[PDB]
Amino acid sequence: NWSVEDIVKGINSNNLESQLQATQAARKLLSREKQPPIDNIIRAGLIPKFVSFLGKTDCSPIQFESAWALTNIASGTSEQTKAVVDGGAIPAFISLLASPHAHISEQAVWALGNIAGDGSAFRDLVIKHGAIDPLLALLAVPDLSTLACGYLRNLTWTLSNLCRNKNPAPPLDAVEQILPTLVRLLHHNDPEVLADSCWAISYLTDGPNERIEMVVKKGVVPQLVKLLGATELPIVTPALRAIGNIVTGTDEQTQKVIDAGALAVFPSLLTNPKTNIQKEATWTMSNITAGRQDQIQQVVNHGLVPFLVGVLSKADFKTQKEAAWAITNYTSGGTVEQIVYLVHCGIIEPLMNLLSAKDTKIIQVILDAISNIFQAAEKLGETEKLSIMIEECGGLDKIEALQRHENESVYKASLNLIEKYFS
């Protein structure tokens, strides 16, 4: 392990092989897992020399060592990545994508992924320097299976960073350019590749309905549903996020997820031992019961209402919050006979128990669903039977107490139920 001083004296020799040995030494320092001295290397002024070494086609080793060293500097904080971009590294790394040496072009792919991964600005800057064409050209084989495994996974990960982040989202023509390759990677049989492809799709579907449509139009929903059923949690997680993003769009974009069979997986997702899976699955459910009445009917037919009752009854609080939203959306748009069905599944008492939570918003959504259920009973004349049910499982003490607390939207809606249904 060399000192930074000796690396400096070596990089300033004007001796190419001395510079190569000093760049190895720097590379090995920057590859240590416990406090790599990124700031010391930056503060020593080494970055402009590293960038110049990227252009040395004659000495491919020093190209590799410098790309390696620069990759790890760009893996740090936003300021340390900035120092790499400020040294002119983006155009130099893009030229390296054409390297006849696979390990060197791979290192350029990795480094550009670290730069783009910083945020919207550097991601769009990487794109404006024209990185997408040479990157996609590296995947222009008839069968991805002939590419080296680690090589392919670095490509996939870097491309996913180009799809990443909002304010703003990647440029429209850049994503149109990337999608065809991205769908190919989505059908590849490597789990690491599948996971990052799913992440990219989840980023692209995280926005307005125009962005959602652009992904749905490429036909990925059936493949996302299949990956939804995978045994690998790193695959299910981004796949469920992408599906959940897609059902935030139009009712017909949501229909494509239902037609692909996504609901059949949700008994598993709504009882998953991983908290985040349950929350995301319930959140997805909440956006499906916000849809058309025939879409609520498919939730019922797939037997998912008892699963929503169970997640409402016992789950992490954030998941229970999403479950309450699912029921309010269900009760807002459903026919009275889907509402009746919801009551016969046992919704009332888990819904009354959540009225004692110290969260003001979940309370508000629950009262609003109690209202919706009463209005359905009002078209059947069973407002007496319901008020008994709410009183019989201990829910009326809750509404009486809520009738007088801090928030304004609650008690104006809390007294409404008291003086309209209990007298």
């Binding site: 090995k28 590859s31 240590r32 897992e33 790599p36 390696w68 990759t71 790890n72 760009a74 893996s75 740090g76 990545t81 990795w110 992924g113 670290n114 991964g117 910083d118 990960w157 960073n161």
Partner: peptide
């Protein structure tokens, strides 16, 4: 966001 390559 980012990945450091290790030994």
């Amino acid at each position: 966001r980012k990945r450091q390559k290790l030994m």
